[PDB]
Ligand SMILES: Cc1cc2nc3c(=O)[nH]c(=O)nc-3n(C[C@H](O)[C@H](O)[C@H](O)COP(=O)(O)OP(=O)(O)OC[C@H]3O[C@@H](n4cnc5c(N)ncnc54)[C@H](O)[C@@H]3O)c2cc1C
Ligand SMILES: Cc1cc2nc3c(=O)[nH]c(=O)nc-3n(C[C@H](O)[C@H](O)[C@H](O)COP(=O)(O)OP(=O)(O)OC[C@H]3O[C@@H](n4cnc5c(N)ncnc54)[C@H](O)[C@@H]3O)c2cc1C
Ligand SMILES: Nc1nsc2ncccc12
Ligand SMILES: Nc1nsc2ncccc12
Ligand SMILES: [Mg+2]
């Protein structure tokens with residue numbers, strides 16, 4: 208059995224690709240992963256996804272898309288793909304001890320936000336801990352918050368957040384910032400931002416919501432506590448391209464390269480969408496858009512065979 | 513009064529840009545047009561927009577996005593922009609006898625589908641007449657339908673539609689097809705497709721829904737009637753770039769050019785999204801995605817000033 212299309216991933220990109228491929232009668236086979244639903248599964252209210260005047264929670268939205276894919280005939284499997292063979296007319300995915308094959312594959316594995324790895328981080332996510340100033344900065348009006356990271360992203364997150372927060376404490380493990388000079392001088396100039404170099408978070412305190420962070424100096428080991436009600440983590444993202452490394456061309460940061468404004472990868476019959484590709488916008492609505500394009504690309508490519 | 517951002521257009525691209533710009537506290541000023549709401553205002557059920565397991569009508573979806581923009585503080589005006597001055601630090605739009613100025617402008621005027629211009633076409637839209645095989649081909653399972661056009665798009669629409677329709681009659685005013693050779697031989701090969709060259713539609717019949725088309729030979733004037741229950745119009749699209757011609761760089765077909773995978777135009781502080789730019793995918797979800805990107809681009813650019 209060789210399917211027309213296999214989709215790997217179950218965030219907005221993968222489910223939108225599945226909706227379009229199923230409605231196009233391609234009977235898509237979708238491997239959602241055991242941690243299915245993408246990054247919105249791990250948040251609370253999603254307010255900037257167009258179409259919901261009153262907002263919708265992450266899991267509610269993601270279950271709408273999943274049922275929508277099912278309604279049109281997508282075959283959804285809550286299983287991880289463990290290995291892929293993507294070269295040639297027939298592509299293979301390996302799921303545990305099972306194999307499945309298709310003529311086209313849409314890569315929609317997304318990107319992981321890098322975590323601090325400290326107690327409280329996971330429990331308090333969507334409850335004071337966030338990775339996305341565009342998404343949640345709204346909710347921290349007149350509050351004291353922290354941003355963690357030393358790059359352009361953390362610089363941009365911290366400066367953006369000062370239009371809501373009472374104050375922004377920018378925390379970084381070293382005393383060198385890898386951010387660009389222009390980005391660095393911007394938040395230096397911002398009066399609502401204070402830098403803490405050579406500082407790490409060791410724990411996030413929070414009754415139901417974030418109440419404080421425990422800090423440690425990476426040089427002296429001196430510890431203290433900071434009272435804050437938000438923690439924005441901006442220490443980078445890792446595209447989930449491990450499956451395809453050595454098969455599809457990646458950029459220096461591991462994102463899947465695509466041709467022009469399309470979803471075509473370096474391999475014939477292989478298409479990529481969502482935050483696996485995009486290191487610029489990283490929103491549900493942009494990932495959904497690109498999942499639609501991947502399905503249209505794949506359909507047109509299949510027609511040319 | 514110089515606003516941070518003015519948005520021109522009220523389809524998915526413009527309303528998604530407004531949601532993001534308003535939530536980012538940029539107080540966007542949006543000129544929706546008198547025919548506001550974009551192309552989905554003119555359709556019935558929208559089933560492939562991810563997030564609605566049971567579908568939603570075009571006007572329902574578009575009113576959700578409009579109220580969503582309002583909720584976050586966008587200033588919406590149901591007025592047409594009649595002229596623009598986009599060069600320089602302060603951009604001007606002219607609306608009748610009124611002027612409004614901004615530091616950044618997001619162009620979201622969309623693309624018009626070219627119409628046959630015959631009686632019944634407008635009344636029967638969403639009721640048997642469509643411009644989008646991806647959108648509505650589903651609903652014509654086992655029916656006899658027509659596709660109008662002589663280019664690659666009509667070729668692609670006709671071949672795609674044969675996975676639903678009982679038969680597809682492809683109609684074109686001339687006996688030369690401007691479509692590529694490969695596209696032309698594909699539907700020639702398709703057994704469900706019959707060509708009618710030198711033929712135009714003069715009228716679409718339809719009690720509540722399409723029941724037939726009246727035809728005329730463009731050489732002899734011979735007329736006849738064809739019993740069909742769908743009419744797919746695929747005679748091209750016209751991007752609504754008239755406002756900006758001579759100011760922003762356009763491609764040979766009038767689409768606004770953008771840099772790389774961003775929404776940046778050839779003019780500083782001017783960004784473009786939706787079907788004004790995209791001649792490839794042309795879906796609500798892709799237009800919404802690109803409207804999000806335009807607002808993120810604009811915000812980042814405004815921060816650099
Ligand atoms: C806490 C948080 C809050 C956010 N809030 C918002 C918000 O309010 N608005 C907004 O627009 N954006 C928000 N985002 C961002 C948005 O969720 C992402 O940009 C978007 O989900 C990207 O979708 P994607 O499909 O590319 O990938 P992902 O969402 O990462 O989804 C990919 C999915 O595929 C699965 N997968 C990966 N590898 C495999 C494999 N080998 N086999 C099987 N399955 C696999 C993953 O487990 C995951 O479930 C938020 C992100 C986070 C982390
Ligand atoms: C009949 C039909 C059915 C469709 N069905 C579907 C479907 O089921 N699913 C799907 O995904 N896609 C569908 N589409 C396609 C989808 O609607 C478009 O791809 C999408 O709306 C593009 O959005 P846009 O914002 O770029 O432009 P548009 O939707 O064209 O919106 C632009 C808006 O801006 C306004 N505007 C333009 N110029 C000015 C000006 N100078 N001043 C003020 N306002 C101005 C216009 O009047 C219009 O209201 C359909 C299209 C049609 C025609
Ligand atoms: N726990 C942390 N505080 S700062 C930082 N930077 C990278 C990784 C972890 C941490
Ligand atoms: N009414 C028509 N039938 S075919 C065609 N082609 C272009 C414009 C109109 C028409
Ligand atoms: Mg995983």
Ligand SMILES: [Mg+2]
Nearest residue numbers: 242244245246
């Ligand atoms: Mg996840």
Ligand SMILES: [Mg+2]
Nearest residue numbers: 545547592752
């Ligand atoms: Mg108009």
Ligand SMILES: [Mg+2]
Nearest residue numbers: 547549550551
């Ligand atoms: Mg319209």
